[PDB]
Structure 1
Amino acid sequence: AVTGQVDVKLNISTGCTVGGSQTEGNMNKFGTLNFGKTSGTWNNVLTAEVASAATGGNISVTCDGTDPVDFTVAIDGGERTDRTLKNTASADVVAYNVYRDAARTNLYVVNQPQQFTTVSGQATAVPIFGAIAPNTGTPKAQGDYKDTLLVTVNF
């Protein structure tokens, strides 16, 4: 019998809120990274942007304050922690990655707070640009591949 304590805390004072999300039960549904349909072996880098579940556009984070606030954005490694989509039925995997800029260069490194700014009376967008490498080796099995990345807007 090892009984222990867990201090719970919350500082209600002046915070920042994330728009574009829908409450899926008790977990915020931020959006979808839909690469679309594809064949077994694709030569072009498959690339799609996150579509917020609430509006359809990009996640719009706004801060409830007057002065500028510097908030951070961190995305985790997915269900299996290595950013791989898994086929619903078979065990095939599809490696992918999420970048922050339009040219697939600034990668959202696993469990890292990619910095962000937010200004007076405005909603800043959180671009989560997906990208998949060209698979010109083995044709992955037919079906639907999925993953649930947990995006962590933290301060």
Structure 2
Amino acid sequence: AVTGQVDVKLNISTGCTVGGSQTEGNMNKFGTLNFGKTSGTWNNVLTAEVASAATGGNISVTCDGTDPVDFTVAIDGGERTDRTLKNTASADVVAYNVYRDAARTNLYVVNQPQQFTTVSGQATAVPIFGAIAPNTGTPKAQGDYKDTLLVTVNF
């Protein structure tokens, strides 16, 4: 019998809120990274942007205050922690990555706070640009591949 304590805390004062999300039960549904349909072996880098579940556009984070707040954005490694989509039925995997800039250069490194700025009376967009490498080796099995990345807007 090892009984222990867990201090719970919350500082209600002046915070920042994330728009574009829908409450899926008790977990914020931020959006979808839909690469679309594809064949077994694709030569072109498959690339799609996150579509917020609430509006359809990009996640719009706004802060509540008058001074420009600096908030951070961190995305995790997905269900299996290595950014791989898994086929619903078979065990095939599809490696992918999420970048922050339009040219697929600034990568959202696993469990890292990619910095962001936000001014009063404005909503800043969180571009989560997906990208998949060209698979010109083995044709992955037919079906639907999925993953649930947890995006962590933290301060």
TM over 0.5: yes
**Deviation sequence 1:108-134 (CA, Å, 0-9, x none):** 000000000000200000000000000
Matched-pair contact (CA < 8 Å) for 2:64–2:120: no
Q: TM-score, normalised by structure 2?
A: 1.00
State TM-score, norm by structure 1.
Answer: 1.00
* Whole-Å separation in 2 of the counterparts to 1:109 and 1:149: 13
Q: Whole-Å Cα distance in 2 between the matches of residues 66 and 94 of structure 1? A: 44
Deviations 1:80-121 (A, max 9, x none): 000000000000000000000000000000000000000020
Q: Deviations for 1:2-53, whole angstroms, at most 9, x for unmatched residues? A: 0000000000000000000000000000000000000000000000000000
Which runs of 4 or more aligned residues in structure 1 lie more than 6 Å from their structure 2 counterparts after TM superposition?
A: none
1:32-77 deviation digits (Å, cap 9, x = unpaired): 0000000000000000000000000000000001000000000000
**Structure 1, unaligned stretches of length 5 or more?**
none
Aligned length: 155
SS of equivalent to 2:78: coil
Cα RMSD after superposing both structures: 0.2
Percent of aligned pairs with the same amino acid: 100
